[PDB]
Design a protein around this ligand. Structure first.
Ligand SMILES: CC(C)[C@H](NC(=O)C[C@H](O)[C@H](COc1cc(F)cc(F)c1)NC(=O)c1cc(C(=O)N[C@H](C)c2ccccc2)cc(N(C)S(C)(=O)=O)c1)C(=O)Nc1cc(C(=O)O)cc(C(=O)O)c1
Length: 369
C-alpha cells in the first residue's frame, strides 16, 4: 500500500539488501536478496553452514515439483537445484499472493554469505536471461500477469543497512528533485547507455562506446561500480592522481586490501566525484548522476576508520552496483522501457559536495553492437 512498503529492505553493510517473503502453505518466512542483475527466483532448500533456515517443500500442500533441474552461474558464486512452483507473497509488499516458479537450491558454491542473513534471491530482470531459458517466467512477470500490480518497481537503497522496494508504483514521498529517465536499451539485463564519464569535471576522453563495452547494466545485486578494462584503468589513474598526497598499498586499488584513518579524520575532500552521463529520453539529451567518495570507498569492519575501494574491473561491461544505487531513488519502469533516477532522502551528506541527479545536457551511437 506504500507507507506499508517504505523501509522493507534490510542488510548488513556490503552483504546485500533483502526483503522478507513467504513461500508455501502454511507460509514459510525467508529473507530474499533483491537482485536486478538476474531473473531466477531461488531459495536454499537444504541445510548449509550459512543458512539458519530454509525452504522445505514437503511441508507445503501447494508445492508442485516441475521435475526439471536448474543451474545458475553468477559472477561471484553459483548454484543448482530443483525447479517447481509455489505460492508466494510479500508481507511488506502488495497485498497479493501469486503462484511463481521457484528454484530449490540443493547445492551451491560461494553463493550464500556468512552472517548476511538472507536465504534466497529475487532476480528482477527479464525472461531473456532466465535459466534454463526464457520459458521460465520470472517472479515479477507472474506478479503482473496474475494480479493488478502495475508493471513497475522502485529501489531506494541506503548506505552508512536499509532501504525500500516499492512494488507497483512510485512513492513520491521518498525522493527530492525530479525523476530523470534513461531508456532500457533492451529487455534482458536492465541495460542502459552511458554517454560520458567525468572525474572532478575532467572528461575521460574515450569513445563513448568504451563506457558500454559490451553492455552497461543497473544491478542491485552487485556491490561495486564495475568498469570495462580501459575505462577502469583510466578512472583509477585519475583517482590515484587526485589523492597521491597520501599512501595506499598498490593492491588497495584492486580491492584486496584496506586503507585506514583515525576516527572522524578521513580526507574525503581529496577523493574526486564521479559523474556518469546517462542517455536521455529525447534526441541528443543526457542527464548525470554524480557519485561521491563516500560511495565508492565502502566502510569495512580496534577503533579506526577503514575502507575498501569499491570500483573494480570487469570484462563483461559496466555494472552500476549498489555503489551507484545507494545515493539515489531508482525506478525500474518496465511498462515504459525506462529507468528513472532521482536523489534520495537517505543520500550522502557532507558539508561540501552532494550526490545529485542533474540535467538536461546535450551531445552529438554509444551502444556496443
Ligand atoms: C545468470 C545471470 C543472470 C547472472 N547475473 C549475475 O551474475 C549478476 C547478479 O547481480 C549477481 C547476483 O548476486 C549474487 C550474490 C552473491 F552473494 C553470490 C552470487 F553468486 C550472486 N551478482 C554478482 O554476480 C555479484 C555480486 C556481488 C556481491 O557482493 N553481492 C552481494 C550479495 C551484495 C553486497 C552489497 C550490495 C549488494 C549485493 C559482487 C560482484 N562483484 C563481481 S563485485 C566484487 O562487486 O565487482 C558480483 C550472470 O550474468 N551470469 C553470468 C556471469 C558471467 C561471468 O561474469 O563470468 C558470464 C555469463 C555468461 O554466460 O555470459 C553469465
Amino acid at each position: 500500500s506504500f507507507v506499508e512498503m517504505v523501509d522493507n529492505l534490510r542488510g548488513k553493510s556490503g552483504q546485500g539488501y533483502y526483503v522478507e517473503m513467504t513461500v508455501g502453505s502454511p507460509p514459510q518466512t525467508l529473507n530474499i536478496l533483491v537482485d536486478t542483475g538476474s531473473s531466477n527466483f531461488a531459495v536454499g532448500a537444504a541445510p548449509h553452514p550459512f543458512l539458519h533456515r530454509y525452504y522445505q517443500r514437503q511441508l507445503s500442500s501447494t508445492y508442485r515439483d516441475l521435475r526439471k533441474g536448474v543451474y545458475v552461474p553468477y559472477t561471484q558464486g553459483k548454484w543448482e537445484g530443483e525447479l517447481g512452483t509455489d505460492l508466494v507473497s510479500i508481507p511488506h509488499g502488495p497485498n497479493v499472493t501469486v503462484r511463481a516458479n521457484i528454484a530449490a537450491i540443493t547445492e551451491s558454491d560461494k553463493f550464500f554469505i556468512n552472517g548476511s542473513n538472507w536465504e534466497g534471491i529475487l532476480g528482477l530482470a527479464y525472461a531473456e536471461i532466465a535459466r534454463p531459458d526464457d520459458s521460465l517466467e520470472p517472479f515479477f512477470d507472474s506478479l503482473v500477469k496474475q494480479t493488478h500490480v502495475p508493471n513497475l518497481f522502485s529501489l531506494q537503497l541506503c548506505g552508512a543497512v536499509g532501504g525500500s522496494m516499492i512494488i507497483g508504483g512510485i512513492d513520491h514521498s521518498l525522493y527530492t528533485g525530479s525523476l530523470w529517465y534513461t531508456p532500457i536499451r533492451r529487455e534482458w539485463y536492465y541495460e542502459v547507455i552511458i554517454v560520458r564519464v567525468e572525474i572532478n569535471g575532467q572528461d575521460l576522453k574515450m569513445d563513448c562506446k568504451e563506457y558500454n563495452y559490451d553492455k552497461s547494466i543497473v544491478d542491485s545485486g552487485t556491490t561495486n561500480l564495475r568498469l570495462p578494462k580501459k575505462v577502469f584503468e583510466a578512472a583509477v589513474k585519475s583517482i590515484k592522481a587526485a589523492s597521491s598526497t597520501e599512501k595506499f598499498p598498490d593492491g588497495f586499488w584492486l580491492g584486496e586490501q584496506l586503507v585506514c584513518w583515525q576516527a572522524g579524520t578521513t580526507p574525503w575532500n581529496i577523493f574526486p566525484v564521479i559523474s556518469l552521463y546517462l542517455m536521455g529520453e529525447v534526441t541528443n539529451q543526457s542527464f548525470r548522476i554524480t557519485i561521491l567518495p563516500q560511495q565508492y570507498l565502502r566502510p569495512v569492519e580496534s577503533q579506526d576508520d577503514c575502507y575498501k575501494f569499491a570500483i573494480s574491473q570487469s570484462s563483461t561491461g559496466t555494472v552500476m552496483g549498489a555503489v551507484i544505487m545507494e545515493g539515489f531513488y531508482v525506478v525500474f519502469d518496465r511498462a515504459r522501457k525506462r529507468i528513472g533516477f532521482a536523489v534520495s532522502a537517505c543520500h550522502v551528506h557532507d558539508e561540501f559536495r552532494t550526490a545529485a541527479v542533474e540535467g538536461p545536457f546535450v551531445t552529438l551511437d554509444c551502444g556496443y553492437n
